[PDB]
Amino acid sequence: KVFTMMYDGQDLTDYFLVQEVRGRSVYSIEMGKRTIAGVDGGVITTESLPARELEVDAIVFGDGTETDLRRRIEYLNFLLHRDTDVPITFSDEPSRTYYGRYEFATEGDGFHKVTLNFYCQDPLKYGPEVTTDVTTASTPVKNTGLAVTNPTIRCVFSTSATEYEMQLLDGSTVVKFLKVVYGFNTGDTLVIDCHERSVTLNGQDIMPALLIQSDWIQLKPQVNTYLKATQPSTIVFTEKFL
Amino acid sequence: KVFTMMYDGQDLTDYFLVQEVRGRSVYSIEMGKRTIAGVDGGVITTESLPARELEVDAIVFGDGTETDLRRRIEYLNFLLHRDTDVPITFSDEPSRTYYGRYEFATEGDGGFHKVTLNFYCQDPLKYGPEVTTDVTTASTPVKNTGLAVTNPTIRCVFSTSATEYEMQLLDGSTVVKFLKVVYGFNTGDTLVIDCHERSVTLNGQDIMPALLIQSDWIQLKPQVNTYLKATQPSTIVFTEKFL
Amino acid sequence: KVFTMMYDGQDLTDYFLVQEVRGRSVYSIEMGKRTIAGVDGGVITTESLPARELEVDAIVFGDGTETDLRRRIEYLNFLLHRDTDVPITFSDEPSRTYYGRYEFATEGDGGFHKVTLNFYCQDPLKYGPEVTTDVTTASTPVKNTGLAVTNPTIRCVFSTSATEYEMQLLDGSTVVKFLKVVYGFNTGDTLVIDCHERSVTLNGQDIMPALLIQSDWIQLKPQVNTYLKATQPSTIVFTEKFL
Amino acid sequence: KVFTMMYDGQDLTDYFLVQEVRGRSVYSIEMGKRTIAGVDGGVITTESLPARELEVDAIVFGDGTETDLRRRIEYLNFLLHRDTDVPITFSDEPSRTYYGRYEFATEGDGFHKVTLNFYCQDPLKYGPEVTTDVTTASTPVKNTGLAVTNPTIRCVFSTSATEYEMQLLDGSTVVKFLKVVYGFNTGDTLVIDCHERSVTLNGQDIMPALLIQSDWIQLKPQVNTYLKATQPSTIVFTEKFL
C-alpha cells in the first residue's frame, strides 16, 4: 500500500513513484507594501493569498523496454493535460481535496526523476462536509474547519409556507439574513452560498424569490455562528484549510 | 543495430553517435495567470501547448584525419539546414513522426567531439499510424486510438446519385456539429480534410462554397467514441497523435 | 512489468525498487606479476578470475508508516541473510543464474530510503541453459554454445552387455583425454559429472575406483567443437556458462 | 573508416567506440636509487624498462535492448580473456604491433564508458621486418628501428660446405661470431636470435652444430653494423620502438 496521488480520479502513482510533495507547508502571503522617502517604516496596502503550486517529485518507473517507457510518458501526458480545475488528493492527507490542474514539468537526471508542477487557482484544501440542524431558535453552529466557509441551507417543509427566512444574529440583533416569499409544503428549498443557487421540491432553481439583496453568509473558524430559521432547517458547510 | 535518428529521410546517425535525446518527456503547458491585489488566488486566462525543442546529445565520430572531420561537419550542416519543417524519427519510438527543423548547436570537449543539436518543432505533437474506419448511413462510433485530439479526413465514393452530402457529429440523437455540401453526382470520390481545411472532388477540385452556413469542422477526442452518420456510405481517416 | 531480482527464489523487488545493478560488465583478471631489477619488462606468473561482487542500488519503498518501514527492513534482512550460496537472477538477463549470497549494505539519504546491497559470488560465472547432445560410438562433434569453459556430464543407458565403458576426447584420431570404467551390466543408466567429480549408477551408487589410471576429466572449450567417442551410445549434458 | 583496435586478430572496435588510448607516450624508466645519510646525492644502482600498460577508454555501444547489451558484454569478455600474450594493433599507428593481454576494466559513468587495461610483458612495439644481403666481405647493416634488435641469419647454399661462419666486426677485429661445422649444398640454414634456433634444407633444428658458445648478436639503432659471412647470406631483423 504505497503513497497514492489521485488526479481527476486517476491514480497517477500507477505510472510514477513519489519522492516528495512540496507546496503544502506553511502558506505565504502576498502583501502590497508602500514606502515614502524620509518616512520610517512601510505600509501594508493590500493582503491576499497567492494561488497554490503543488510540486510532486516523482520517479517514472520504466517497463524495461525503451519504447515501453516512451509510450508510458505519452499516456502520462494524456492523464495530466486538463483544460479545467480538477480534484487532487494525497494518501498521507485523507479528508482533504485540492482543486487545480497540472502545469509544467522539470526533468531531472539509473532512472527518470521528474518534478510535476500543479497549479491551484483556489489556494484552499476542502475537507469533510458537516450537516447541522438549525431550529426556529438561536442555534450555535461551529465551523470545525480552519478557514471561513460558505454554507448550504436546506429546509424540507413539514407545514404550509408564506415567507422562509434564515436569520444570522449577534445575540439578538439580525446581522444578515436570507428571505424567500414563495410558499408551499412537502418539498426541499436549497440555498447554496458557494454556488449561489435556490432549488425546490425536486430541484428547480427559484432565483426571483431572493427579494432584497439578502447578504451571503459566512461561518468564521473555531468559533460558534448563531443561526435562527422560520422552519426547522439544516446547515451544511464544508470544512476548509490552508 | 544502433539507435537511428532520421531527419528529412536522412540517417543522421551515419554522421554521429547519440548519447541521449531530451525533449520527449512529460510535456509542459503555457498558462496565462491573472492576479488581483487583495483578492485570494489567481485565474487561468489562457492555456496553450508550447512549441517542442528536441535536444540530441551526440558524438561526431571522427574519420581519423582532421580534414576528414572538418568535411564531415560541413556535410552535417548541409543535411541539417532546412527552411521548411521536416519529418523527424527515432528508432526507440517506432510508429511516431515529429515535424520540425534543426535550430542550433552548442559545442563541447578527446579523440571525439560532443555536441548537442537542438531541433525546433512548430507543431508540438507526434504523429502516429493513420486509421481508416467505415462510416454508415446510421450513427457509427469512431474511436480515436491516439492520445490527443485529431482533425480527421472524410472520403466518400458515390454508389447512387446525390443532391446534398452530409456528415453529422451527434450526441445520441442530437446533431452537435455537421458537414454538408450542395454539389451532387455519382461514381466519384469526395474528400473533407479537417486538418488542412480543404474541399476535394475526383481530381481534387476546390468546392470552397460547400461549407455553407457555419457547418463546423469537428474533431475526434482521444480514447473515446465519436458518433458520426453520413448520407452515403463514407470512410473516415484520422491519424493517431501523441504529446 | 518492472525489473525483477530473484534471490533464492524470493522476489526481492517486492521490497525495494532497483535504480541500477553494477558487477556485471567487462570482467577483470587477477595477474601475478614478477619483476627483476635491471631486467626490462615483467612476467605473468599466475592468472585467475576474481570472485564476483554484484552491487544493487535500490530504493526501499515505504509503506507510509514509520513502523511499517522498520518491519519491512527487518523482513528484508530475513530474506537476505544466507549461510549458503544461492541462485540470483535479473529480469533484464533471462536464461542466466548467478550463485552467491548477500554480504553488506551501505546506506544513504526524502520520503524514500536509498541503499546499495552488495552480493558476493564465490563462483564468478553465470550459468545459462543446459544443452543435451547425443554421443555415438564414432567421433562426435559436441559444440559448447556457452562463452566459458564447461565441465560436462556423461549419461549412458545400456542397450547391450558391458565389460568396460570408455569416453574418449580426441584430436582427429589421437586420444588426448579419456574416461573408462571396468564395471559392466545392461539396462541401467551411468553418470560421470566433471563439475562435481562424481561416479553414478541406477540409484546413484559411487564407483570411486572407476577412474583407474589418470583417465582425466576433460572440459568443453567455448564456441568450438569437442570430438567425443563412446563405447555405448551416450548422452552428454553440459551447461552454457558466461563471464 | 573509424579508429580500429585489433586484439588477437579480432576487431574489438566492432563492440565498442574508442575515446582515447593512453600507454603509448613518453616511456618511463625504473631506477634503483640508493642514498647514504650525510652523503650528498644519490646513486643509480639499477635501470630497467617497466612492463607496458595500454589503457583504452571506450564506449560500449548498446544494441537498444537491455538483454542485447548484457549479451554483448558477455561476448566482449569472451574476446578479451586470454592466458597467452597476443598481437595488439591500432589503426593510427600502422606497421606497429604490441604483445600483451587484457588485464582489468574500470567502469565509469547516457551510456557505458569503460577503461580496458592491457598488460604487456614485453614493453616494446615491433615494426616492419627488414631483409638485407650479407656478402663474403664486411657489409654495413643499418638497424632502422629505434631499439636494439636480434636478427635472423639465412643462407641458402650454392656450393658445398665444411664450416659456415657469420662474423661480426669492428673494422677488422672479430667482436662476436656464429659457427656451424655441418656442411652440405642446396638447402637453407636458419640462425634466429630472438627464438635461438638452427633450421636446415627444409626446416630441421640442427642444435649440436653451434660448437663453442658463439655469442648471440644484436644490431644497435640508427647505426651501421658490420657483418661478414662465409657464403652469401641474408640478415633479417625486425625494427623495434619504445
Please give the single-letter amino acid code of residue D188: D
D-chain residues near C126 (CB < 8 A): 74
If phi over 0 gives left and psi between -120 and 50 gives alpha, with beta otherwise, what is residue D63? alpha
Resolution (A): 3.0
What are φ and ψ of residue A111, in 5° steps? -145, -170
3-state secondary structure of D73: helix
Best of D59, D67, D69 to substitute, by most chain B Cβ atoms within 10 angstroms, is: D59
Give yes or no for A75 touching B (CB within 8 A).
Answer: yes
Residue A208: exposure state from Cβ atoms within 10 A (0-12, 13-18, ≥19): exposed
Nearest-CB residue to B41 (from A32, A49, A116): A49
Please give the single-letter amino acid code of residue B5: M
Residue D92: exposure state from Cβ atoms within 10 A (0-12, 13-18, ≥19): middle
Nearest chain C CA: its distance from A80 CA (Å): 22
User: What is the distance between the terminal CA atoms of chain D, rounded to a whole angstrom?
Assistant: 27
Q: From CA C83, how far away is CA C75, in angstroms rounded?
A: 17
User: What is the distance between the terminal CA atoms of chain B, rounded to a whole angstrom?
Assistant: 27
Considering only CA atoms, which of C151, C133, C155 is closest in space to residue C199? C155
Q: From CA B125, how far away is CA B49, in angstroms rounded?
A: 9
Breaks in chain D (C–N > 2.5 Å) following residue = 109
Strand partners, B46: B32
Nearest chain A CA: its distance from D70 CA (Å): 13
Q: From CA D80, how far away is CA D69, in angstroms rounded?
A: 16
Nearest-CB residue to C25 (from D32, D105, D122): D105
What are φ and ψ of residue A154, in 5° steps? -140, 120
Nearest chain D CA: its distance from A64 CA (Å): 8
Q: From CA D154, how far away is CA D193, in angstroms rounded?
A: 11
Q: From CA C168, how far away is CA C175, in angstroms rounded?
A: 6
The pairing of beta strand A164-170 with beta strand A224-229: antiparallel
3-state secondary structure of D67: helix
Q: From CA C125, how far away is CA A233, in angstroms rounded?
A: 79
Note the helical H segments in chain A.
66-80
Largest CA distance in chain D: 73
Q: From CA B9, how far away is CA A241, in angstroms rounded?
A: 57
Q: From CA B26, how far away is CA A79, in angstroms rounded?
A: 11
Q: From CA D153, how far away is CA D134, in angstroms rounded?
A: 9
C-chain residues near D83 (CB < 8 A): 47
List Cα–Cα distances, A127 to A43, A98, A101, A141, D36, in angstroms.
35, 9, 19, 17, 87
List of residues 6+ apart from C75 with CB closer than 8 A: C15
List of residues 6+ apart from B94 with CB closer than 8 A: A67
Q: Which residue of B has its CA nearest to A50?
A: B41
Instruction: Give, as one character, the DSSP assignment of residue D221.
Output: B
List Cα–Cα distances, A187 to A229, A236, B120, C225, in angstroms.
16, 18, 62, 94
Q: How many CB atoms lie within 10 A of CB D150?
A: 16
Contact at CB, D83 and C40, closer than 8 angstroms: no
Q: From CA A88, how far away is CA A125, in angstroms rounded?
A: 9
Nearest chain D CA: its distance from A102 CA (Å): 28
3-state secondary structure of D180: strand
Nearest-CB residue to C38 (from D48, D73, D74): D48
Contact at CB, C59 and A2, closer than 8 angstroms: no
Containing H/E element for D69?
A: helix D66-80
Containing H/E element for C77?
A: helix C66-80
Q: From CA B171, how far away is CA B151, in angstroms rounded?
A: 18
Residue C70: exposure state from Cβ atoms within 10 A (0-12, 13-18, ≥19): exposed
If phi over 0 gives left and psi between -120 and 50 gives alpha, with beta otherwise, what is residue A203? left
Asked whether the beta carbons of A25 and A34 are under 8 A apart, the reply is: no
Q: Cell 494561488 identifies what position?
A: A51
Nearest-CB residue to A64 (from C19, C91, C110): C91
3-state secondary structure of D80: helix
Please give the single-letter amino acid code of residue A87: P
Angle at D38 between CA D36 and CA D39, to 5 degrees: 60
Q: Which three cell numbers stand for residue B41?
A: 488566488
Angle at C225 between CA C227 and CA C141, to 5 degrees: 45
Contact at CB, C111 and A64, closer than 8 angstroms: no
Residue D200: exposure state from Cβ atoms within 10 A (0-12, 13-18, ≥19): middle
Nearest-CB residue to C17 (from A17, A63, A64): A17
Best of A4, A24, A25, A61 to substitute, by most chain C Cβ atoms within 10 angstroms, is: A61
Instruction: Give, as one character, the DSSP assignment of residue B150.
Output: B
Instruction: Give, as one character, the DSSP assignment of residue A177.
Output: E
What are φ and ψ of residue B48, in 5° steps? -150, 155
3-state secondary structure of C83: coil
Give yes or no for C210 touching D (CB within 8 A).
Answer: no
What's the gap between Cα A87 and its chain centre? 10
Residue C201: exposure state from Cβ atoms within 10 A (0-12, 13-18, ≥19): middle
Nearest chain D CA: its distance from B124 CA (Å): 24
User: What is the distance between the terminal CA atoms of chain A, rounded to a whole angstrom?
Assistant: 27
The pairing of beta strand C165-171 with beta strand A197-199: unpaired
Name all domains of chain B by residue range, CATH numbers in brackets: 1-128 (2.40.30.200), 129-243 (2.60.120.860)
Q: Cell 488542412 identifies what position?
A: B196
What's the gap between Cα A49 and its chain centre? 14
Q: Which three cell numbers stand for residue B1?
A: 543495430
Contact at CB, C111 and A2, closer than 8 angstroms: no
Interface of A with B in 44-73 (CB under 8 A): 45-51, 60, 66-67, 70-71, 73
Strand order in the sheet with D86-90: D10-11, D5-7, D86-90, D98-107, D112-120, D52-60, D17-22
Considering only CA atoms, which of D193, D181, D185 is closest in space to residue D155? D185
